[PDB]
Each structure stands twice: as structure tokens, then as C-alpha cells.
Structure 1
Amino acid sequence: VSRDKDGSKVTTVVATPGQGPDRPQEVSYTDTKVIGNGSFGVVYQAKLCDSGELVAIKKVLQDKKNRELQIMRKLDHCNIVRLRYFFYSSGEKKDEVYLNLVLDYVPETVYRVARHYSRAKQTLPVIYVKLYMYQLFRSLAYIHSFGICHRDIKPQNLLLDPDTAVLKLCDFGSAKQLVRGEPNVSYICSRYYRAPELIFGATDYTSSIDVWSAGCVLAELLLGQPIFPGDSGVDQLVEIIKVLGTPTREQIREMNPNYTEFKFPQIKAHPWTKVFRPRTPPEAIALCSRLLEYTPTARLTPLEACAHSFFDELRDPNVKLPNGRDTPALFNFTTQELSSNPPLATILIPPHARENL
């Protein structure tokens, strides 16, 4: 609204703070550069003039309540990107308004970190896989406690600080609160991480679609490549049958009950130990088998995933990041996270850090 020039170009905007009271404040940012394009809009990078901290501004068009804003405003979690401020500007289309979302700036993503190891034909050390997965499940347990389904869980949406090993879930644009009765669109997630019940056209799906997507990211981090690389919507199901086998009539009823059960070419389930490279940690395979499951209700909950034996290293008091630093926050659990499965609190929070209530 007010482009000044002190350093070279300072934009000063009355941006409402996201988390907290609707006390509109004046916020100055500089170093404005484009860091992403698309149909959603544009994402800029910037540096706040007051604090000097780095931020990312996501600019989208709005008309007449925006779901992404209402969700970003309600969420506050260490493993979720924070909506620092939001404000309404103009731009690429005159006569139209633009919602700007000022968010935490994170330098890297799980996708880019994994692509580095994949290009070198090397596998990501499991301590990274444990850390990134555990944090993703905490962010999933938090948002699911409010009934919010992310519906776009992919490695490109797992912001990452490679020095602190902190993971931030981002891109809540496709997210939605799921209520028991109301139907929801079935063509939603990113294909590589789409749940089978979504391919089967289920409109009564639950948050289990996110846990499936996470299992696809666990397998992708253990394999070096996507486990279900579907050419299209029909291939995607074919890719799942190559590993999980043909779904059982019961399973097809759990995925989409409205779906007319048919006699499918019964393919056998390829054993899980053979899908992964030799000497892949057995607990990593055991968890993936409990997340990539046809029956949505049989998939683990995000808190149950966190309590799996695969993550026991993260609960070792002597655990440290390989760069020397100590691990990021892993047991700063809030009652809301632990709301479902309360007794896991004494399992998730190890003895060496029971001060977390």
C-alpha cells in the first residue's frame, strides 16, 4: 500500500497479526523477491524491518471468507509454519483483492534434502528419517485433534531447517475441517500420495488420508523414490496393487461403501521386507506396513505412529543430531496433541524429559 525507499524499497502495510487479537499493526518488510509461482498465486520472500527476521508472503486472490486463513489463524504448533501476519493488497488483476499471508521462512524442504541423497545414489541416514517423520506425525496429530485434514501431504510441503533439523508443515490451502456427515471431494491429494479410498471415489473419507500420505513419504525416504509413482489416476491404483495386493471385498467396503464391489484380478501382496532395500531397519518396515493399509480405520493414528519402536532412538537421552547439536523439541507435547490416546503421554515423553507434564 505504501512503498517507501530507505534502504532501497520498503513496503509498509497495516497487517493484522494472525495468531492472537485482531489488533491491526503496521509492518515493514524489504528484500522482496519472488520464490514461487503457480495458479494459487505467488510466494515472495522478505525481511521484516523491525526484527530483521526472514518471512515468506503467500499472495492469493479472494472474493466476498477464506478457509486457509481461518485455519492458519487457529493453528499454533512448533511443527507447523506460523502465520505471523496477514493483510489484503492489490496487484496482478486490477479490480481484484489479494490476501497476503506472512509466514515463517524455512530454508529447505524434505524433498530437496532427499533429492540430494537420491542423486548421489545414497540413502538418507535413518536418524533424519526418524526426525522428519516423527515431527510430521506430531503436526498431523495436532491438526487432526481439531478435525482439520491437510489433504496435500507431500515432501514438497515439509519445510525443513537443515541445521536445527526442525520440520514445519506448510501449504494448508487444500485443508478442510471434516465433519461426519458432509461429503468431500475425492480428487484432492497429490497423486503420488493419494489414498486408495480417494481413488475408489469415497466422499465419506476421514483424516486417515493424511496418514496414508505420510506412509508414502516414509517409504519414499527409505526407498530413495516414490513407492507408488502413478502415471495417472488409474495407474496410481495399479501401483498400490503391485505392493499391497488386490483389496479384499471387506477392504473395498471400508474404503468406499457406496462402491459396487466387483471381482478384481486377485494379485498377491508383495512381502514388505522385499519391497525395501536389504538391511532396511525392520521397525521402519513394520511402521510402513501399518500406515499403507487399504482399510482406513486399520491405519495407525498419528500419535500411535509417534509411539512406534522406529522412533525409540529419538527417545534415547543420549541422542544428538549428527552435526553435534542436540535434537529439536520432540516431547513438548500439549494436552490437545495427546487428547486422543492419552495414555501414550507416558510412552511418548521419555523418563529423561518427564518435566513436560
Structure 2
Amino acid sequence: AITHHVKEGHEKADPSQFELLKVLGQGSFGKVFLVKKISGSDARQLYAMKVLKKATLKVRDRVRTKMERDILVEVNHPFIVKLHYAFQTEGKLYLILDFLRGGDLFTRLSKEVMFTEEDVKFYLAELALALDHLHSLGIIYRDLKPENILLDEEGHIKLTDFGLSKESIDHEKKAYSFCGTVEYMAPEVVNRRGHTQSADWWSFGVLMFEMLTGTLPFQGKDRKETMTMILKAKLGMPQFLSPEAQSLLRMLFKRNPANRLGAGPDGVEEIKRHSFFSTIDWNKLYRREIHPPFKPTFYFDP
């Protein structure tokens, strides 16, 4: 067949259509800004804009920004951020995402020092559904940390950054990269022996421990000592933790990923049926019908 030498025409989304309001923080590969849509049907809408600068030379951050875009286009879940636009200019990549009005879980944790078990059970329950959804698509999230868990106006969670995630992990395939925050890494990530979706359940345990106690379970004087402490996995259990919390933590902190809670044939059901989550109605939770624990004039002359 002979090629028809013609070009398709489209009205392209451009960064000039988003008014820059303020910097929200730093994602895995660039800054995140609060922006307001100028034109079109969604004029006046607030969004979070993630920008990757000098994308042409930054090959590794560019390949992963594309994977992040691909992941966000594929996913449709209540607890995973929605992507509204993705576009590029010379040397820059842009992702336009939901603006989460409640800020991140790290800010809340830092202010409270530690959460009550009721609050932890809520956050972890929504997170378990989000992680399982990703796992069902062959994705390893890998970057669990409270900075990556955002809260909406109602107090429900959203996972928002997929730059360090891994796609196409199914059957006998393993990932071998060493990316993410060290303290949350599974031992198989630290020793470079290969990791699968079961690495996320170790990270889920670290996050659970940190939210319940205000401290990290495996941590040394520097990142290299933290790495060896993860490999020894000698856990000091704080005595204010309930028997249900202690059971879940011991079941997640299995160094052998094959023996870890959630790695068995029933997958996420092993976690959902744990006594720690016995009061959770998972159907109501998915429907966003469970009330979150936190939801983000003087003149008088009657």
C-alpha cells in the first residue's frame, strides 16, 4: 500500500492553558504545582500539575514519566489519583492530575506523632484495595511512604506518584531495581535478589508500624546501616500495640516473600480477612461509604 502524505489536526493541550497558583511540593522526578484551568469546558477547575524538566537528557526519569502516564490512563479506582491530561513541549513533560485538597498523610502523621488503631485500620484498608488493584494489573507500587498518600476533601486516600513503580510483573517475572525510600524496602529489594508484588506487603507493614508508633521499625544511623537492619529484621515490638496489630505486623514482616501475608494463593484476601480488619465492610469501603477519621464572622447585630 502507498502512504498518504497527509497530517491529522488536533487542538493540543498546552501549559499556557493552566494558570500557575503555587508549588505544592516535589514528586519523584519533578515539582508539583497547584494550577487553574483557563479555557475549555473545565475552565476554573483546580488541578495538580507535575512537571519534568530537561526531559531530553534525563532518559531514566523520562521513561518512568511515560510508564506513570500509562499506569494512570489504565487505572480506574476510588483510591488512585485520576490523570486528566498529559502533554509535552521541547524539553518538558506535564501530567495534570486531581488536586487533593487535604494534603498528604505525612503532614497529618507528623502533627499527631502517631494515629489511633481505628484511624490506621481505615487508612490501611483503603490502601490495601488500591495496592491490590495495581497488583491485578501486573504492577508493583514500590514507593509506599506517607508523602505518596494524599487526602481528598472528604478524607479518603489517593495514591498519587507512580514514577518508581514497575509494570508487567506476572508469572515468574521479577524486578531488580533499587528505588524508593530505604526504610520501606522489603529485604528482597535491599539484597537485590528480585522482587514481585509481595514486596508491597512488606512496605504496607512498615507504614502500618510507623503510623501506629510514630517511628520506623528498621532503621540505623545512616542508609547503609538501615539496609543491614532490614536484612536482619530483628523487630522490637512496642507493648501498646493490640494483639491484632502485633499478629498482622508479624505476618507481614516475613523475610521470605513466599511466606508473607498477601503472597499466598488467596492474595489480598489473606490481608482482608485478618482479625486486625474484622470491623471493615470492604464493599462499603470501596463505595467510599465509610466515614474517614479526619475531614480537611465577628459582626453581630440581630
TM-score of the pair, normalised by structure 2: 0.77
Contact between 2:126 and 2:286, CA under 8 Å: does it hold in 1?
no
Judge conservation of contact 2:106–2:146 (CA < 8 Å) in 1.
Answer: yes
How far apart are residue 51 of structure 1 and its match? 5.3
> Can you list the C-alpha shifts for 1:13-32, whole angstroms capped at 9, x where unaligned?
8339xxxxxxxxx9943343
- Give, in whole Å, the separation in 2 of the partners of 1:144 and 1:182: 13
Q: Percent identity?
A: 31
Q: Is the 8 A contact 2:49 2:97 kept in 1?
A: yes
- Secondary structure (helix, strand or coil) at the match of 1:78 reads coil
Q: Which residue of 2 aligns with 1:42?
A: 31
**3-state SS, counterpart of residue 279 of structure 2:** helix
Q: Cα–Cα, structure 1 residues 288 and 242, in superposed 2: closer, same or farther, change >3 Å?
A: closer
Contact 2:166 2:175 survives alignment (8 Å): no
Q: Is the 8 A contact 2:27 2:50 kept in 1?
A: no
Q: In structure 2, what is the Cα distance between the partners aligned to 1:104 and 1:145?
A: 23
More strand by share: 1
- What is the SS of the residue equivalent to 2:285? coil
User: 2:97 corresponds to which residue?
Assistant: 103
Provide, for residues 50-93 of structure 1, a one-character-per-residue CA deviation record: whole Å limited to 9, x for no partner: 35332111111545962111111111111011111111134xxx
Return the alpha-carbon distance in structure 1 between the equivalents of residues 196 and 190 of structure 2.
Answer: 14
**In structure 1, distance between residues paired with 2:132 and 2:230:** 28
CA distance in 1, matches of 2:32, 2:226: 32
Candidates 244, 259, 268, aligned match of 1:283? 244
SS in 2 for 1:100: strand
Which residue of 148, 151, 154 corresponds with 2:145? 154
TM-fit CA distance, 1:38: 6.9
User: Residue 143 in 1 paired to residue 118 in 2?
Assistant: no
> Which one is further off, 103-112 or 61-70?
61-70
| SS at structure 1 position matched to 2:280 | helix
Give the Å deviation of 1:313: 2.6
Per the normalisation by structure 1, the TM-score is 0.66
Residue type of the alignment partner of 2:257: P
Tell whether the 8 Å contact from 1:149 to 1:175 is kept in structure 2 after alignment.
Answer: yes
| Separation (CA, whole Å) in 2 of partners of 1:182 and 1:218 | 28
More contact order relative to length (CA 8 Å, sep ≥ 6): 2
Q: Separation in 2 of the partners of 1:84 and 1:307?
A: 35
CA RMSD of aligned residues (A): 3.0
- 1: CA distance, partners of 2:157 / 2:30: 24
The number of residues matched between the two structures is 261
**Cα distance, 1:74–1:27 mapped onto 2, change above 3 Å:** farther
Match of 2:293 in 1: none
Aligned position for 1:330: 285
Contact 1:30–1:46 at 8 Å: present in 2 too? yes
The correspondence of residues 46-65 of structure 1 with structure 2, limited to 5 A, is 46-49=35-38, 50=42, 52-61=44-53, 62-63=55-56
Classify 1:47/1:212 alpha carbon distance in 2 versus 1 (closer, same or farther; 3 Å). Answer: same
SS at match of 2:85: strand
| Structure 2 residue 95 is the aligned partner of structure 1 residue 69 | no
Report the Cα offset of residue 298 of structure 1. 1.4
Secondary structure at 1:47 match in 2: strand
